Subunit: 473 residues, 4 copies
């Protein structure tokens, strides 16, 4: 049975047993005991005590811990890949080739970034007084990881927090805790006792006790708009600082000018990768009238060829949805779309028969801007196509969204590419590609998609405190 990491020691949860499912088979993998309210407190106390020493360590010392942690993960790559695949339904080959190396890279990046923090020039801004600017750690940080990319999001939250010199108490999703608890075993001795704490449990029993704790200085979350609203109004009286990543409905803007085959191949991969359970998924397509019909046919052929199957089988391209509950939300969202007279189901449409939580790759055409399928996030293997005419029009539509995380523009015109990317209200804009992320570049939303960034130097800065020290001569 997997254990919890509290103050450098592995312990069994004193809370209620919770069952962890295998989304590909619908069967229960294991049963893990949650953290009790007293253990959540114990974890925060451990972090609070550890901070006095850990917050004074040099960036060099911290970089060395992160590099050591990265090595541990890389050496255990295969094991993490099997767990992540078994617990999430992600095709095994994708985890081994894409995710694990990305995770390893994230730690290495932050190890380096920890020693490169920006400041302002120290000097005499006021006659006879030397001012300087330092970036100190915040203190105790509570991290809540989502279920779509369990280990990767854990990395996105641990790396910058630890690099900045904070103590962390992280809770993975109750749906997907395996990789996080495995990491806890390896990282146990890498950091001083209390610096890293890994808990387990539901957002109602463990999550709320953790985020509401008086000694937690910052709460970084990744989830849906629903679970994000809950935490932001729960931590409001304490005036805690937050870091929000709350999904998105990434628009894919295609002009007549675009390479249709490249768009089709891109949407085939990026709109259905990880069963479309991704905040940056290419799920909302705006196709210009001229190429609309041609693109719809190409997408139809590309999407319908996606092979669904066993995650451990090399040929499998599409896995199942994370849980029974999520399968129901996706089904409902697709049914509302089919109910609309003008919506054409090009391929897929409903959930497939079998043990797992599989849902057929769906392509919905002739969708209109006002439709729910275009406005609300589905977070499943569903893609919609909407026709448009001019730039001004598509730009207004893209920007008239509650979301603002990622987007892509497909066009060959240099002028148009830069003109739109400058005006889109999305934290990220790809041109003639989509879904590509790198450790050096920031990833974060705008509007209801949240605030604060993952990865890059900006990601590290969110876990620091700018401080002004002024000495009088």
């Amino acid at each position: 049975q997997y254990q919890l990491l509290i103050n450098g020691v592995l312990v069994d949860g004193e809370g209620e047993r919770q069952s962890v499912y295998n989304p590909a088979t619908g069967e229960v993998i294991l049963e893990i005991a949650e953290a009790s309210p007293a253990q959540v407190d114990a974890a925060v106390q451990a972090a609070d005590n550890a901070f006095a020493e850990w917050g004074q360590t040099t960036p060099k010392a911290r970089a060395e811990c992160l590099l050591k942690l990265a090595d541990s993960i890389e050496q255990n790559a295969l094991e993490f890949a099997r767990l992540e695949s078994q617990n999430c339904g992600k095709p095994l080959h994708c985890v081994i080739n894409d995710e694990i190396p990305a995770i390893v890279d994230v730690f290495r990046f932050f190890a380096g970034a920890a020693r490169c923090l920006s400041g302002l020039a120290a000097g005499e801004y006021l006659e006879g007084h030397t001012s300087m600017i330092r970036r100190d750690p915040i203190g105790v940080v509570a991290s809540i990881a989502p279920w779509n990319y369990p280990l990767m999001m854990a990395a996105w939250k641990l790396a910058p927090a630890l690099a900045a010199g904070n103590c962390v108490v992280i809770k993975p999703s109750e749906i997907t805790p395996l990789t996080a608890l495995k990491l806890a075993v390896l990282a146990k001795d890498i950091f001083p006792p209390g610096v890293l704490n890994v808990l387990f449990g539901r957002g109602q029993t463990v999550g709320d006790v953790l985020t509401g704790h008086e000694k937690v200085r910052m709460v970084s979350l990744t989830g849906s708009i629903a679970t994000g609203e809950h935490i932001l109004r729960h931590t409001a009286p304490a005036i805690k600082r937050t870091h929000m990543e709350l999904g998105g409905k990434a628009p894919v803007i295609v002009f007549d000018d675009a390479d249709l085959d490249a768009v089709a191949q891109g949407v085939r991969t990026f709109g259905f990768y990880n069963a479309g359970q991704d905040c940056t998924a290419a799920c909302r397509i705006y196709a210009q009238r001229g190429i609309y019909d041609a693109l719809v046919e190409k997408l139809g052929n590309a999407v319908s060829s996606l092979k669904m199957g066993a995650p451990e089988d090399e040929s499998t391209e599409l896995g199942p949805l994370s849980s029974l509950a999520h399968l129901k939300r996706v089904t409902a969202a697709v049914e509302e779309a089919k109910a609309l007279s003008h919506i054409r189901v090009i391929t897929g449409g409903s959930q497939t028969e079998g043990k797992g939580y599989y849902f057929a790759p769906t392509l919905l055409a002739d969708a209109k801007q006002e439709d729910a399928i275009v406005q609300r996030e589905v977070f499943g293997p569903v893609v919609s196509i909407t026709v448009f005419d001019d730039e001004d029009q598509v730009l207004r539509w893209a920007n008239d969204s509650r979301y603002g995380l990622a987007s892509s523009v497909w066009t060959q015109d240099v002028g148009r590419a830069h003109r739109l990317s400058a005006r889109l209200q999305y934290g990220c804009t790809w041109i003639n590609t989509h879904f590509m992320l790198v450790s050096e570049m920031p990833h974060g939303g705008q509007k209801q998609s949240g605030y604060g960034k993952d990865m890059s130097l900006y990601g590290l800065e969110d876990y620091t405190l700018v401080r002004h020290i002024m000495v009088k001569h």
Copy 2:
């Protein structure tokens, strides 16, 4: 009869009439009509529409507007000084010499800062893809100004917001709206219609309608922990980004090693400036045992010599408190302190007889760490002194606070000065001085004092959105 600025036009408030008092005489200066819920909506709509054009302006164009605005204020310095003094009770000479030039400087600083935003090096972080980082405006910004420094805090909120390319809807405190409404008349033509909107009203009628509006992307506030908690839980479902400045209880740590006369003179000025109605006020003193008694006597002499009087009279050093309601809170806080048997009233103690809301400069000695007078913010002309022994001890006490805005250390030891300033959990730490602020350096709290900064390049960055654009070759 002052008007509101909505979409480049001056209009009369359709809401209820509200009376504005002169704290020095206790008399009503004027009666101003509040903004109606429809006008608050009209103001936000005006800003939202203006953003399409304003967000695309060059930093150069924006810098020119700010420089032009700064000139307007400087040319009307004397008029603003009289209004600010009449409405706040601030000694006139202090407003003319300290505040107005500071306000003018803030605009000039941001005018320059607008053209110096940081980014990451553009390049190929991923083979065959050029990534670049841009800092774009957030959109519509709602600013709520406090009553202690009406025009200055207005500047602290308008300058960075406008420099970053946002559209602002600002509401000054109902207690002190004169300077803001005066600024509205001058800035009317400097910015395009809708870019700058100035409203008026109570936090319950106007403030809540403004901060809760769906089109407001960001809310920047400066006030108490009470009004801050209210707004943060009100905007929580919309997942809006905030900028909080929520007061503080600035500690003044004095070692045996310190220059006692310099401390006394400093506390005389900085602990009672603006009637102690300042977040950075030197109000909580920790004096080391060796020099404790000597410092208490020096402070007694320094504080009791503060001349209270008419704001327009050149000799006046201390003005009244902002309002009748605040006079009552300060009186209550001081009475609770006097009730404690161990507290010694060195000077002052209670409110002075007369028309205005004057309160005598109070010095409370022998206060203990656990006392309410040391833990809770008084935000009045009240200073407490607590004895201490070692650094470790005073450091724990200073850090065991809900507040984290400013602090000062008075000592001659180079080692000690740097050792403590590195470990204090305050956004700002002065050494052998206190209260000194400069436009280039950041000012912002930690913990319950808030997050986000006023002034400096960091102040401007809080009003921008980091965006990652990636072009595939």
Copy 3:
């Protein structure tokens, strides 16, 4: 008689009288007395003494001087425009509309930039030691301005130097000293005595005494490769730090994909602006085979329509060359090109008959990569066109150059635009435009075009000294 500015006082040069010509009429405007070797020494001594006080001023204080200087220039815009036009032959309307506002903007930009210098985060990089980074002024700076943009280059050298907190001794070109000496009269009282020193004379008598002086810490130059080599080997034993701007042969790469009319209009303006006497002039064109012939015809029509005439006449588009000596160099360079059998003269060709130093706008086609007309800088109203086939080919040719200042690529392909701009070895690369400069962005060469940059924060950083201060706890 124009005077020199030494130690806050205006004085007559003790050196030999030098005549200043009007390039449009070939007549002498005035006669100015050069600075004597003793006065050059006096100027450097004045700067050296003034540095003790000036180097300690706050960035705010310096920003205020620059803003005040900018106002003075803007208020005297028309007068400077007439002098610059009379002394350089530049069409008056271009000076009033383009140059003066640019100059004013440069000062304003640096006034703001002075308060935004970058540093690294202060902190404990070594246990028990606080490290911080400050940017201090270099000391006494000697600036040598060129003759093509007398007042603008003066601004490019004075603004960052003064903003950084240095004391400057500037010498404009003996050919064009009017605007600089006029500026000296206005700036006289803006800066403390000795902070700004304006001298006059030939590079042999005044320039060498100034650049070789023991108290000059840095020398910033803008001129030809010849005058640059002379100064770099003259200051070599003193190990002085330099800032070089040594011309360039900006390539204009045009693909089949490009908008030919936009290229023609661009080359018409940017290849002949200021009589082609500009380091960034679009003088070397590489046209892809597909559009070669069509572009040559369009350029022929565009270039031949350029109206040459009196600088004060509104319709004049092309002025004369700076001096008789330069007219001879340009004539010689063009004659060597005509001598080559394969070179086709599309338009212009030789110097025009008349009093001024006018040279007809020349377009030379069928030029080959190895030709002298393509390799060496002409710095006149001459443009060459070379045919090319692939990207790899044109990229090798563009990079196989001693120069590396500016360049432009004309194409509609997003991929190509970014792929080439990433690989070009030029300090600047424009896409579908050319010659556009802004105060916020850096301008500086690579290879023999020099090192160090003009404008932007990078321009200011070149006049500062990064210093590491480390305090042991």
Copy 4:
């Protein structure tokens, strides 16, 4: 016999055989064949060809090479330590504990720094044009390493150059080539053929051919003012960009206020570390009158106790000088000092009898500001003490120096510490310590000590080219 690294292959030098000495025994260790002029050309050609591919690699790819190189050095720590100690005379324990880990850290630091380069925010600085800033590699870099810290300076030159994406051709000092040639064997396969080239030979035969080569874009040097003047005037016609590190005479300013025992211990270590053969050596002491006599006695006791002996013996604190030629320069410099009637020899004085190039740790007191022993660098185990009275006085003396690399101030006054460190004209100023360097912080001189920095992000920036790309919409 050690080989050269040219285009990924190890080859024997075709030049004349040169003997490498063991400074501790005065005996010849080995005889190595120099690189022939044709091989130096072959090395540069190899680098030039390799640049096309290497300059396009991602910062991630480069970081991975540096991390891999760092591992190789760390795994071979002991071997490098023995070679460095045998070839330089450095006590073995110092190399194992101080140098090797520092070298390893430098590579790791730059591996991280390579992915964190600064730029300016991309955006529209000019209406309808997107500007962005990229930092591209310079091209082929020629590095000349000094003899004092052979492997460390090699690291200081290779790490940033390679991290920035340049191709390097490095030549260690002919006196100390062992560690560099050993590194060549290990790094052979880590980088693509031609990216890293290691040559060997005298500055006259190999050095001049390398630095004068037409394809070398940048030359980074570390040596004396003599060898620096030679290279700067040799590369002057090519207008190559340089990076100079030319020694220094680090002042140690001690006030009455200082901890004399801490100063004595500091000077004992830092003034004689590596036999005083260091640019940052605490060799020039200014002691305030009050503590002058007391400090001279303490230094006398501290210096005379330094144990000289075999480098491989654990107890050895002081090693010999690098070569017979340098032993002669040091002896001459000390003899000129002894000749002065006012100079008191407290300890040491002359060279010790024995096989090696040992020189006794010398302390010269009562030295005056004008004396040659205080003005010129000795670069040996020699320390001078000068008395002073006021700050203004000592500040003028410290700044009236041709050197400007490092310095230290010993005082307990916070005001004084910051007031002096702000005004010292040295690239580095330590307070109550000396000689401490960290990878994150810059190390570089001012005035005749050179320009450009080693270590930190600034160190990496010197090997990049800021480029402005502007796309028109």
